Amino acid sequence: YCQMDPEEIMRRVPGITRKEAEFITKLGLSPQEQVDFAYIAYNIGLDIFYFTNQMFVARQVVTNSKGEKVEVLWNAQCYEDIAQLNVGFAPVLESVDYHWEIFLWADPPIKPNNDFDLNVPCTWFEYEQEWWMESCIQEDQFNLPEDERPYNTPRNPHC
Amino acid sequence: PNNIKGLIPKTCRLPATRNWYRRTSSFERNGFFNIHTPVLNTKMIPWLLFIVLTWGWSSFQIGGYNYERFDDNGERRNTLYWKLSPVEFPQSKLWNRPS
Amino acid sequence: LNHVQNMLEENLKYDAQKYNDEVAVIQKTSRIYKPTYTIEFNREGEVLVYSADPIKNSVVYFKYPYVLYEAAIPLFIWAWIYNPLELSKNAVNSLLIYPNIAWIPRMWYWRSLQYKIQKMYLLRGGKVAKIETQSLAGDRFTSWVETYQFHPLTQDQKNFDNQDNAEFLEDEGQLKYELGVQLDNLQEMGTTSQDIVINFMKEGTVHHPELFEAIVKGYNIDTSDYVINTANNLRAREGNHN
Amino acid sequence: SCTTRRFIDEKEKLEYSRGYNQQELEASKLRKDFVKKYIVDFDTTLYKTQVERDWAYIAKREYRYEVQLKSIGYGGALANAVLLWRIYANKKMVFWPIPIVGALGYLYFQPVFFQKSNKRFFDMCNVGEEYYLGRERNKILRECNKILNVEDF
Amino acid sequence: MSAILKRAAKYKRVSSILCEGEAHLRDPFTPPPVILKPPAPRKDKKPDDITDFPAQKLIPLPESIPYQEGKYRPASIPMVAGFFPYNCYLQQGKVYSWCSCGISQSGPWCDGLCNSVVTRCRPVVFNVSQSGYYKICNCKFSANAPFCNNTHRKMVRYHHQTHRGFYEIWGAALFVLGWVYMGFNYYT
Amino acid sequence: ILKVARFRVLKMRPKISTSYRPHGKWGDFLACIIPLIWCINILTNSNLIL
Amino acid sequence: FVPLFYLGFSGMPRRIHDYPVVFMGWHSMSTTGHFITLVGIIFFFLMMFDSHIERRASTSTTLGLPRWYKRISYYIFKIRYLQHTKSKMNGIPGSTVRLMLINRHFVEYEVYE
Amino acid sequence: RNRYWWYRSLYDDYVAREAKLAFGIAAFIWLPHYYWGIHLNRAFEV
Amino acid sequence: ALFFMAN
Ligand SMILES: CCCCCCCCCCCCCCCCCC(=O)OC[C@H](COP(=O)([O-])OCC(O)COP(=O)([O-])OC[C@@H](COC(=O)CCCCCCCCCCCCCCCCC)OC(=O)CCCCCCCCCCCCCCCCC)OC(=O)CCCCCCCCCCCCCCCCC
Ligand SMILES: CCCCCCCCCCCCCCCCCC(=O)OC[C@H](COP(=O)([O-])OCC[N+](C)(C)C)OC(=O)CCCCCCCCCCCCCCCCC
Ligand code: FES
Ligand code: FES
């Protein structure tokens, strides 16, 4: 219930509006997470007023290179198990629908393979792939304070 | 009774410093009852230490030492010559391991 | 069960219903403090109001109440090993009970060392204070706590200290003694705990004595007169001399 | 055997509890002097024959566990008692009671545990008249038999 | 409030710089601190109001940083990745990228994993004037950017000074001493 | 066990596991040294009794 | 199945319906364990019956976010989880009222003012 | 040795803190077992 | 093995 100042959230993320900052402060995130979530939501065009359900977990309005202002819906997923997948058509979290025939029309599911030549460099938060690993190694690491780290050491002769 | 000698009347609420016992459970502000609190971890450290480490690595040695110290390793004492007799071994099969 | 009429039960029901109805989540307060100077928040919109190194200034190993138990341990182990009292098999094991429970007070003390405040910042808006502490194993804990949660304790910490009139800062502005503050609800690591006592050690730097005193005395500080210092000096997981 | 060892230990405890006479004290002094010299004050690996070395080392190990280690443990218990007293009195950790009181306890308890188990160590040297250690033990045994007006083995 | 204001005249403030210094003094790419003052408060607050605070200079992440000649403060705390310097043969006139983050799989060199971790540690692209064997820093804390200046010894000493590091080193020492004690008592 | 019993539940400092796939440095080599020793032990003992 | 290890160490062959007298003890314990197992089996079936008196729609604990590959997934899960828990904790009184009810439970006093 | 090599050798998972804390406790839990095993070995030899 | 019996 500790709410970051909406003015401060707007200052940290200059392009974010007052309503978005206030609504983010009305969520349960700690102030660091509030500012971080504001940053992510503004940068990726996320819609923060979208309520998470078992159809789509998020909604994000982005204008593509042709300026079409499309929307992208982040679905609800399951870990390798279609049996654990909530195949529903309602904005709810419960698993109310039970299907005797999963592939009703006999259309197979698909796992799309990507051509290596047609791949694109990773840009969906690419800087987080090793993050967790590093942060598991730096939690039990003691760092030498800058007061004790030697500085202005002699330059290497050949560099 | 109001005026009782030897008792300090409670004018105001007392801090948590005066508590004799430390709660291992708490309440969330919305009414949710936390059983697994940060105090519970510190309280569970000794029980887990004794169950997992201390008991499984000292109980059989204590048992064998007491068996030799008190029961003479269960010897049938009516035997003639120690140099010509088999030795009643101390306990060697651990009873605190599953096998 | 309900057909039995108890006036104390009826009073309890009335109290619960009246508290549910009349007492609201949003509470009006008049405890507002306006600092006499311009507050210079950092690049993250929070001004550091207290800093310390509680582990460096505390006795970790040779503390009196616990060295006694840990020095009594070998006596019990020897008494079991040699059995000078000629006890039976169960009594010597009863002697061996003690070494398992003699280091627990030291565990509680070492845990208490992590409730001494290492850093305290005042966020913008003057209604939230960020408290950073560190355990004896290097783990670091951060907790955002509302200013009204703070209740000062006396010097002896036996009784609560009167708000709006209490001198835990000397004339210059530094801590006069190790100040104890009770929090009605502290969210530590995501679990809310009631009536948590934190300590501000005397050998700690109290930057902004007015803001520190207002936060401890549970004031909503008016941070309208502010500036922002664009100093990116700190880093994540920065070494701090414990 | 365990029964033999327990009987020896408890009989020694009873003998120490009842008392030790005067001629018994003289015989005990002779036995303790012989054992001390020929086992503690001598390297048991320097005897000529293998039998002497083996059984002298067995006697020395028995002395180590029954006198040296027991006296160390009891002196350490006394030092722990004094240490707890001093920690409680000074309300802080102290280190002086460990060395000094431990040494005093060892010096107090080593004669006690040596007097208790003098016969045990003396008899363990009975390797035989063919060896130097056995000959010396038999000479001391004959002197003790003269003192106590009995016959031992 | 009133009680605080009574004593507020005599109160003296203290600087907030402790055990960290100034980043702009020991590190380029960091402009010196600037005091930004807020504008006048808005008369009306609208739901679609963006901030009116003065803009702040925005420095993007450099692809790599040059060799700072003995004056290198890490932009973020790196993973130590070893307390011993590598002894690597560097060829004259060949551009080497030194891993600053420390998570590189390709030894001391950058590889590409600094782009896959949240850090401001960018590789130090450097060139040596003469080929030979150099002590490449592997603790990622040396004031010499790619070279070792014996800072790892200070890091090891600081780790030993910490309570948990002291316990860890003494536990390993006692484990080794238990092995040695078993070897010494093997014939009893 | 202590860690997973005290600091891995959601209300007690969970971790954001951001790793897509594991990248290991001689994994099985460390996981097979302890069993192999056992094998050695067992084999030796059997041979003696055989 | 632990007393069966004990009996196997003592030389108990497999398919004999009569055994030396010195085994019965552990065998009894073994049989005891089996009946404990049987009780568990009963509970299994009971829960299935109890699962159809209940008749509730299952909700996945992942909330549709099985993996927190990014911190935005963590934020979405945290927001939805807090909303879900707030909805669950409806009709359950707040901390203050609950503590008031718990502390003032005892209403049986002989003498009043 | 190499901290980075030894911190992700076990299937890219980090258990180094628990490994470090394991040595100190493991340095003492083996003493009763070792001493009673000495007793058992001496009994077997006798 | 080498020092399996430890004594
Ligand atoms: C071999 C080393 C030799 C050199 C030692 C040098 C110094 C070493 C210690 C330095 C500090 C290291 C870090 C400690 C923990 C810090 C973290 C923390 O918050 O702690 C609070 C924390 C409370 O929980 P928390 O804060 O909620 O969560 C923890 C963190 O958030 C998060 O923490 P985490 O989860 O990451 O870490 C968990 C870990 C954290 O704990 C550790 O890592 C500790 C590991 C063992 C440390 C042992 C050294 C103790 C150092 C002080 C000794 C002083 C001696 C001198 C004075 C007294 C004697 C005169 O928990 C455990 O290990 C579980 C408890 C283990 C208990 C072991 C008890 C041994 C008893 C030995 C005596 C009895 C023997 C017979 C009976 C045996 C059965 C009981 O406490 C613990 O977790 C530790 C509990 C045990 C502490 C007291 C140990 C007393 C030992 C007395 C020995 C007496 C010997 C006989 C007498 C000899 C003289 C005559
Ligand atoms: C492969 C893994 C195996 C183990 C995995 C885990 C599963 C098993 C878990 C067992 C848990 C313990 C069960 C037994 C408990 C009693 C111990 C016992 O009787 O052992 C027999 C042993 C041996 O007894 P004995 O001497 O009679 O030996 C048997 C002798 N013969 C065989 C000859 C007949 O007794 C002892 O060890 C007694 C001394 C220890 C007593 C400890 C008491 C204190 C407990 C402290 C708890 C933790 C702190 C709490 C602090 C609270 C503060 C508010
Ligand atoms: S700079 Fe270190 S991985 Fe690239
Ligand atoms: S490895 Fe030597 S200073 Fe970095």
Coordinates of C-alpha atoms in Angstrom, one line a residue, chain G residues 46-103:
Chain G
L46 CA -13.0 -40.8 -0.2
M47 CA -11.4 -37.7 -1.8
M48 CA -12.8 -38.7 -5.2
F49 CA -16.3 -38.9 -3.6
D50 CA -15.5 -35.7 -1.7
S51 CA -14.4 -34.2 -5.1
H52 CA -17.9 -34.6 -6.5
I53 CA -19.8 -33.3 -3.5
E54 CA -17.6 -30.2 -3.8
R55 CA -18.3 -29.6 -7.6
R56 CA -15.9 -26.6 -8.0
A57 CA -14.3 -25.4 -11.3
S58 CA -10.5 -25.8 -11.1
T59 CA -8.3 -22.7 -11.4
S60 CA -4.7 -23.1 -12.6
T61 CA -2.1 -21.9 -10.1
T62 CA -0.1 -20.4 -12.9
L63 CA -2.8 -17.9 -13.9
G64 CA -1.9 -18.4 -17.5
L65 CA 1.8 -17.5 -17.0
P66 CA 3.7 -20.8 -16.5
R67 CA 7.1 -19.2 -17.0
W68 CA 8.6 -15.9 -15.8
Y69 CA 11.1 -15.7 -18.7
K70 CA 10.8 -11.9 -18.5
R71 CA 10.1 -9.5 -15.6
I72 CA 7.0 -8.2 -17.3
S73 CA 5.5 -11.7 -16.9
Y74 CA 6.4 -11.5 -13.2
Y75 CA 4.6 -8.2 -13.0
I76 CA 1.5 -9.4 -14.8
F77 CA 1.4 -12.5 -12.6
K78 CA 1.9 -10.5 -9.4
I79 CA -0.9 -8.0 -10.3
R80 CA -3.4 -10.8 -11.2
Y81 CA -2.4 -12.8 -8.2
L82 CA -3.0 -9.9 -5.8
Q83 CA -6.4 -9.2 -7.4
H84 CA -7.3 -12.9 -7.2
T85 CA -6.3 -13.1 -3.5
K86 CA -8.2 -9.9 -2.7
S87 CA -11.3 -11.4 -4.4
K88 CA -10.8 -14.6 -2.4
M89 CA -10.5 -12.7 0.9
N90 CA -14.0 -11.2 0.6
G91 CA -16.4 -11.9 3.4
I92 CA -13.4 -12.6 5.7
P93 CA -13.0 -9.7 8.1
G94 CA -10.0 -7.4 8.2
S95 CA -7.0 -7.8 10.5
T96 CA -8.3 -5.4 13.1
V97 CA -11.8 -6.8 13.4
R98 CA -10.5 -10.4 13.4
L99 CA -8.0 -9.6 16.2
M100 CA -10.8 -7.9 18.1
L101 CA -13.0 -10.9 17.8
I102 CA -10.2 -13.3 18.8
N103 CA -8.9 -11.4 21.8

